[PDB]
Each structure stands twice: as C-alpha cells, then as structure tokens.
C-alpha cells in the first residue's frame, strides 16, 4: 500500500494506451508511435503525487483520469510542435509529420487534444475546467509570442521568465494544483502544491535551456545551440549579453540567414562562460523555493517521494 511511483506510472500508461485507440487506423499508429517512443511522464507523475495530501487513502480513478488527460494534452503539444519546427526526430524516432505527413500530424494533435477534453470531464468542479482552459489559452498565446520573439536580441530577462512560465511551468502548475483538488485537499495544501509545481516547472525549463549548450548532438537528438539556431534567446544567452557588450552586438546581428559559423561562434562562447552557471543557479534557487514549501507539508511517504522527485529534477542532465 506504500505508493510505488513506477507502479503508478504504468497504470496511467495503460489507460493512455486504451485512450489512444481509434476508429481511424493511422491516428492510432501515430499516437502509439509517439506514446511508446516514450518520454518521462512527469506531468502524470506530479498529478498522482499531488493527490496524496488530500483525503483519499489510495489514488482514485478520478486522479488517474486527470493524469491521462494531462499527458494527452502534453502530447498534442509535442506533435503540433514538431510540425512547426520542421523538427526531425522526437524521443529518438521520426516525428509524425515525417513518418507520415503534415496533414496527419495536425490531425493527430487535434485527436490527442480532444481526448484530453473527454478525460477532464471526470473532474466535476466547473472551476477547475475554467482554470485549466484559460491556462491552455495562455500557453498558446505564449507559444506565439515566442515564435514572434524569434531572433529578437532586445528582449528582457523578466520577459524570458514570463515566456517559460506560459510555455512550460503552467502545465506543471496545473498538474500539481488539480491533482490535489481531485482528492479534496484544502485551500492551503492546494495553494502549496500549486506553488511547488510552478517552481519545479520554472526550474525544469531553465535546465533544458542550459542543456542545449552543455549536452551532446547525440544525447540531445538535435544539434546544440539548436535553440539559438532557431532564434530563441534563452536565459544563458541573456546573461552573457548584459555583461558582454561585444556578444550583445554579436547577437543583435544574428538571424536565420546568418552563416553557421557566426552561430557556432556564439554557441561556443556561451560554453566557456560563467553564464551557463549563473543560469543553472537560477534553476537552483527556483528548486529551493520548491523544497522549502515541500517541507512545510505533512510527513509521510508522499512527502518523501515529492522531495526525492524534486531533487532529481534539478540534479539532472538529460
């Protein structure tokens, strides 16, 4: 009866496998292709965990259903995301748009998203739905300001944070908030988990951006500087700008049609920099803000699992 995460994730994964079956064959193969090439299922994880501080002595079906919904919405995002970025590989295999075609991927994304809505109707509180829906809207308008920001060397840090909040933190925040609201937790514990999740999410994304310069063409399943090659000016790059007026002008002149060597030069400068570490540092401060609040929660196995999971999240590198 001691909650086992591994075991919990499989129950959500099996519920995802059924949910993906379709009257249309290709949509089924595409969804399964993506589902099985596999990712870390963090969102479903935070939902299960976030519900142990409520009033259910065991995880209810209602919470497994929100977990299934969250991963399906996440997936819809990934699929449409690879169509927009002309991306090549996702989770180590071909993105849908490349294994089939562009029409298919767009359709699969709609499919995945519709299923997510079907599955959220297992929640009964009409305020959660209003909460989850307005959040998805912010996510999307976020994704738009980011595409619209592409190669803008004049953007500010306070503005990069607002961008990773809508883009990534927001759905981790919903995973922890709703997960508690499903097992009837109280104002405080929920407010507590809403905040814990939001901080993990901010740290989460900051880490991705750092790992885009420090990782490997192989472990990243993509170049490196990848985000810069697409014009995304992330935390590491904003930091090196404020303290390096040469690099700042070097970034002001940067755009898609620039020669691969001006890029190489840029991504090569960020690495021997302190900025990769100042960035990592912000991730860390963010993680402590989360660990502090996790402590203020009741002792037990759940609190031990969240503490454990929140500690890998940061001490990660892939």
Partner 1 sequence: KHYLHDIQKSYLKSRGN
Partner 2 sequence: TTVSKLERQIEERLKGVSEYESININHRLGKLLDSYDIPDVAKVACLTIDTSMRHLDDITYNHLSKHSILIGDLISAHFYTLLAEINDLSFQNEISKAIVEINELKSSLHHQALNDYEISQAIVKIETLFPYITLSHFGINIDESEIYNYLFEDMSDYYPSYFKKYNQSEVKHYLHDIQKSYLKSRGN
CB atoms under 10 Å from CB of 138, counted, come to 14
Which region among 18-26, 59-67, 156-164, 262-270 touches partner 1 (by CB under 8 A)?
156-164
Residue 165 touches partner 1, criterion: CB under 8 A: yes
Burial of 219 (0-12, 13-18, 19+ CB in 10 A): exposed
The candidate with the shortest Cα–Cα distance to 174, out of 123, 225, 217, 222, is 123
Binding mask 94-113 for partner 2 (x = CB under 8 A): --------xxx-xxxxxx-x
Residue 148 touches partner 2, criterion: CB under 8 A: yes
Residue 161 touches partner 1, criterion: CB under 8 A: yes
Helices 187-214 and 260-271: angle between axes, nearest 10 degrees: 120
Among 285, 292, 300, 301, binds partner 1 (CB under 8 A): 285
To which H or E segment does residue 90 belong?
strand 89-90
Among 158, 312, 315, 317, binds partner 1 (CB under 8 A): 158
Which region among 95-103, 112-120, 159-167, 237-245 touches partner 1 (by CB under 8 A)?
159-167
Residue 161 touches partner 2, criterion: CB under 8 A: no
Q: State the nearest-atom distance from the C-beta of 158 to partner 1, in Å.
A: 6
Residue 134 touches partner 2, criterion: CB under 8 A: yes
The candidate with the shortest Cα–Cα distance to 169, out of 213, 199, 130, 140, is 199
Asked if 76 contacts 34 with a C-beta cutoff of 8 angstroms, the reply is: no
In order of 29, 183, 195, 203, 262, the CA distances from 37 in angstroms are 12, 31, 31, 25, 34
Asked if 98 contacts 88 with a C-beta cutoff of 8 angstroms, the reply is: yes
Residue 152 touches partner 2, criterion: CB under 8 A: no
Between 103 and 216, CB nearer to partner 2 = 103
Q: State the nearest-atom distance from the C-beta of 30 to partner 2, in Å.
A: 9
- Give the binding-site size for partner 1 (rule: CB under 8 A): 8
Which residues fall within 8 angstroms of residue 30, CB to CB, at 6 or more apart?
79, 96, 99, 100, 104, 105, 108
Which region among 25-33, 56-64, 91-99, 281-289 touches partner 1 (by CB under 8 A)?
281-289
Q: Give DSSP secondary structure letters for 154-200.
A: T--HHHHHHHHIIIIIHHHHHHHHHHHHHTT--HHHHHHHHHHHHHH
Residue 141 touches partner 1, criterion: CB under 8 A: no
Which residues fall within 8 angstroms of residue 67, CB to CB, at 6 or more apart?
12, 15, 43, 44, 47, 48, 179
Binding mask 254-293 for partner 2 (x = CB under 8 A): ----------------------------------------
**Token digits of residue 190:** 């929920």
Residue 26 touches partner 2, criterion: CB under 8 A: yes
List residues binding partner 2 (CB under 8 A). 22-27, 80, 83-86, 102-104, 106-111, 113-115, 117-118, 121, 124, 126, 129-130, 133-134, 136-137, 139-141, 143-145, 147-148
Where along the sequence are the contacts to partner 1 (CB under 8 A)? 158, 161-162, 165, 282, 285-286, 289
């Amino acid at each position: 009866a001691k909650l086992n995460m591994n075991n919990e994730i499989k129950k959500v994964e099996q519920r995802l496998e059924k949910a993906i079956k379709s009257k249309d064959s290709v949509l089924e193969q595409a969804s399964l292709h993506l589902l099985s090439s596999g990712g870390k299922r963090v969102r479903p994880a935070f939902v299960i965990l976030s519900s142990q501080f409520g009033k259910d002595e065991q995880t209810s079906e209602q919470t497994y259903q929100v977990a299934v919904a969250l991963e399906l919405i996440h997936m819809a995002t990934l699929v449409h995301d690879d169509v927009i970025d002309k991306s090549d590989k996702r989770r180590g295999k071909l993105t849908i748009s490349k294994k089939w075609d562009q029409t298919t991927a767009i359709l699969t994304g709609n499919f995945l998203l519709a299923l997510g809505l079907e599955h959220l109707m297992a929640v009964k509180d009409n305020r959660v739905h209003q909460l989850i829906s307005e959040s998805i809207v912010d996510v999307c308008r976020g994704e738009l300001f980011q595409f619209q920001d592409q190669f803008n060397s004049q953007q500010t840090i306070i503005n990069y944070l607002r961008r990773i909040n809508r883009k990534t933190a927001l759905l981790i925040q919903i995973s922890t908030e709703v997960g508690a609201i499903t097992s009837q937790s109280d104002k405080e514990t929920v407010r507590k988990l809403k905040m814990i999740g939001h901080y993990i999410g901010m740290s989460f994304q900051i880490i991705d951006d750092v790992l885009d310069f420090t990782s490997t063409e192989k472990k990243l399943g993509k170049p490196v500087g990848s985000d810069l090659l697409n014009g995304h000016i992330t935390l590491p790059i904003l930091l090196e700008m404020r303290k390096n007026p040469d690099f700042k002008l070097k970034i002001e002149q940067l755009r898609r049609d620039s020669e691969r060597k001006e890029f190489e030069e840029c991504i090569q400068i960020i690495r021997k920099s302190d900025s990769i570490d100042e960035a990592k540092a912000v991730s860390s401060k963010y993680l402590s803000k989360a660990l502090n609040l996790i402590s203020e929660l009741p002792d037990g196995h759940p609190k031990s699992l969240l503490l454990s999971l929140t500690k890998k999240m940061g001490s990660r590198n892939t």
